[PDB]
Amino acid sequence: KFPRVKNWELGSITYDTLCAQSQQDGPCTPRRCLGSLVLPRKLQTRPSPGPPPAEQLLSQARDFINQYYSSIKRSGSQAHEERLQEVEAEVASTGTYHLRESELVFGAKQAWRNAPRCVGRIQWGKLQVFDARDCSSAQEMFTYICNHIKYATNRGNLRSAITVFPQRAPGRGDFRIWNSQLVRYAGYRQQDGSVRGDPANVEITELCIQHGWTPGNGRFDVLPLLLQAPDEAPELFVLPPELVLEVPLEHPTLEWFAALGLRWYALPAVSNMLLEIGGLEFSAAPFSGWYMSTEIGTRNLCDPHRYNILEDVAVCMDLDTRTTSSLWKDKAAVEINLAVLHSFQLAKVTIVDHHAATVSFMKHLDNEQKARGGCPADWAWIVPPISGSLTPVFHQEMVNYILSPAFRYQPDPW
Amino acid sequence: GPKFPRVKNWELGSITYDTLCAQSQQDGPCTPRRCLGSLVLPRKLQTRPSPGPPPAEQLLSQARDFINQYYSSIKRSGSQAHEERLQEVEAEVASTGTYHLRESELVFGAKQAWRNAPRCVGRIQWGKLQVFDARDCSSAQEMFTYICNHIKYATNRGNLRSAITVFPQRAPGRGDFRIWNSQLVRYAGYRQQDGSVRGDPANVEITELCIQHGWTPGNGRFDVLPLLLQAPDEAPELFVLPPELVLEVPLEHPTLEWFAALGLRWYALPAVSNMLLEIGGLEFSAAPFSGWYMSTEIGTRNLCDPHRYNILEDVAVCMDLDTRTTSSLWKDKAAVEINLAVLHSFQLAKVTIVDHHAATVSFMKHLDNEQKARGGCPADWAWIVPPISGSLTPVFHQEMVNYILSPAFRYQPDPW
Ligand code: HEM
Ligand code: HEM
Ligand SMILES: CC(=N)NCCC[C@H](N)C(=O)O
Ligand SMILES: CC(=N)NCCC[C@H](N)C(=O)O
Ligand SMILES: [Zn+2]
């Protein structure tokens, strides 16, 4: 039935009745918990060469349309009943249907709201939705992306946004953004298999040079985009420098930090996920908000398989890197995170630290408890990578489950 | 590929398949519909008081399974001794409704239970456990003697040795042997008039329970609590631990001279005493165990949790940090220094302790050993990854499969 959910810091308890609406299965079973896994083994997004069972697509649609009219307090109204028949009509005749701009906006916001792994969902209602379904080329995707970047960036005063390109069509190819994010630093594999730049982007980097991109030779070279229209070879487009806002990293008191020459971009814009709304799939729907300092300061810069700058900083800090018990790792991680915050604030670019971010997520949980009777959340992804139990979320139990609309992982186009 | 959970390590890109979970003979709280893995106490393992003797039928299969595990472990599966031991257990259950374990079987089961603990990151030490057999114990008084003996062997003047003391199993129509305290060593939690708590808020209940049972309470911030030991069908008796036996460590920072003036301290012996030890169906309601601390348990959870000592702000103020803004990362800075203090103080006092980095690295070694020896290892990510510097340790990047294997350590309802 309904799971009891406790907060070990306050002693409070709540039941989750929202998970009841979950119409999609996760990777867990009573025999064993696989919630710690990042990617689904079967919850993928298999091909769309043959239409989707009208039985299925139709129930999802009726449900989403139902969701939409409850949202505007016009359920059972006339428009509602007639909107349902339109969908019924279109599906029966073509095997698919289309969303109205307004339904799309509602759908995009709900997908974010439902994202179990997002700690910044308190902002879910503030999302600028760019309808890019009137797109027929890779060059057009690029203009749309450039407009999204400009708006989202807004000279450092970041504004959340999503751009939705054409939905998937049976038997036809997908519109796709090959890059995992609109802005990423190249990863160049060198001599002894080592890597210059972002090791996380080695592959996308190689695919780019393999399509005519002239590579640079730095640690932070902004990658070009590989946009792809249905059944066509992806096309390469370089982003106008003045559009890619970046932040040079320096430390408040450690004068030498700026020397490292480290930097990060201001816009976190995930572009390889799929947006599903009422059964319709949007293979290319890039979204962006703003960074929470740990994503850069802890993960991107200190992960062993990423920039892994932990030792360089510890050495410049003159710390005892001989033993683990000197906590040189913990000490250096704290200064790098401080530098990200300080640097972003100094440059007047939006950013939120992990304490403020998780405090605001706690309010969101409360808001959702009242609004829907629960909130799907993935603990491992919600608790910050450093100072975990120093934040409120750590001490809060959570229920993870899939609701629709939703953002989902999808296979790599190559 | 393999029809078992695929487990990946994102740091090293390596993959493995857990086949050991197929051996799980009990479900957890999750379902295809929703994951409840973050719940601390999900009504599943919960070994609730089942007074009436267990289905001889259910106890038999659990018993049969354990015995097979045991003969497997000594490489004698299918042997004559195995079959005879099998017939024996079945006879004893048939006539008495329960059964008993041989000495060597108890030692094996104890170690397996630790080996099987999903929430323990120090399981690389699982094969080195001192099992004190106290199944002959017949009084709260004798319980106190064994416990003192355990603490003395386990403490070993700072050179800590892992151990477990096993008291009599639960019996049909009889009271359970029970240790009311959550740990052989806990600090008192005094409720204040203004509403606050002096000492450790985690033990307020157990503190009021000793008082209600005759303990003359103190008024310190670190008062070692007495033990409430309960023999079958009898009110728990009260016992006070000889101060010389309870080893404690004063906390000082290596470079911050004022930290020591804070008067902070902690005991060296971490000894869980309220968990149930389950082996082949038999239930050991009282079987306290101990090992040694991983610095973050003390430095981060005990001293910095909001509902515990919560000393973060006090230390941050002494460090002259900006505690009015979150972006100054004042909480982080203070946590680090406090964890450093704990580590430094134990090393100075020559008392066994391991930092979160060393510990997680050794747990990664343990995961590899288990992958080969059993085809996997049940682990609870949220509990394995340290409360500070999570992604800085190797386990953070290691996906993990969680499931229940038996023998096992389980939670049990409070005796009162
Ligand atoms: C307003 C600022 C926002 C902040 C501070 C924020 C922060 C985060 C963080 C920290 C994560 C985890 C990242 C990681 O560990 O890889 C995350 C994940 C996610 N967020 Fe947000 N988010 C924000 C806006 C958005 C927006 C506007 C959307 C969508 C419209 C969104 C959708 C998601 C999704 C789907 C994930 C999971 C991605 C994955 O599985 O890799 N977020 N967010
Ligand atoms: C030798 C060093 C040991 C270390 C460093 C170690 C460390 C840990 C840590 C850090 C935890 C989690 C604590 C928490 O977050 O509350 C834990 C949990 C646990 N350990 Fe170990 N452990 C050790 C010895 C033992 C021994 C000897 C046993 C039993 C024979 C054991 C059984 C368990 C169990 C059952 C749990 C979970 C208890 C619960 O649910 O609260 N550990 N251990
Ligand atoms: C919107 C947002 N804040 N985060 C989405 C994920 C971005 C990724 N963790 C990164 O560090 O680039
Ligand atoms: C054996 C061990 N290291 N830990 C068991 C649990 C102890 C508890 N976390 C505490 O901080 O007292
Ligand atoms: Zn689960």
UniProtKB/Swiss-Prot annotation, chain A:
Positions bound to L-arginine: 181, 290-291, 295, 300
Binding of Zn(2+), residues: 28, 33
Binding-site residues for (6R)-L-erythro-5,6,7,8-tetrahydrobiopterin, renumbered to this chain: 36, 380-381, 394
Residues recorded as bearing Phosphoserine in the entry: 48
PTM statement from Swiss-Prot or TrEMBL: Phosphorylation of Ser-48 by CDK5 reduces activity.
Region ranges (Interaction with NOSIP): 32-414
Superkingdom per UniProt: Eukaryota
Subcellular location: Cell membrane; Membrane, Caveola; Cytoplasm, Cytoskeleton; Golgi apparatus
Chain residues that bind heme b: 118, 409
Disulfide bond entries: none
Subunit structure of this chain's protein: Homodimer. Interacts with NOSIP and NOSTRIN. Interacts with HSP90AB1. Forms a complex with ASL, ASS1 and SLC7A1; the complex regulates cell-autonomous L-arginine synthesis and citrulline recycling while channeling extracellular L-arginine to nitric oxide synthesis pathway.
Chain's role: Produces nitric oxide (NO) which is implicated in vascular smooth muscle relaxation through a cGMP-mediated signal transduction pathway. NO mediates vascular endothelial growth factor (VEGF)-induced angiogenesis in coronary vessels and promotes blood clotting through the activation of platelets.
Protein family membership: Belongs to the NOS family.
UniProt-recorded name of the protein: Nitric oxide synthase 3
Species annotation: Bos taurus
Lineage: Eukaryota, Metazoa, Chordata, Craniata, Vertebrata
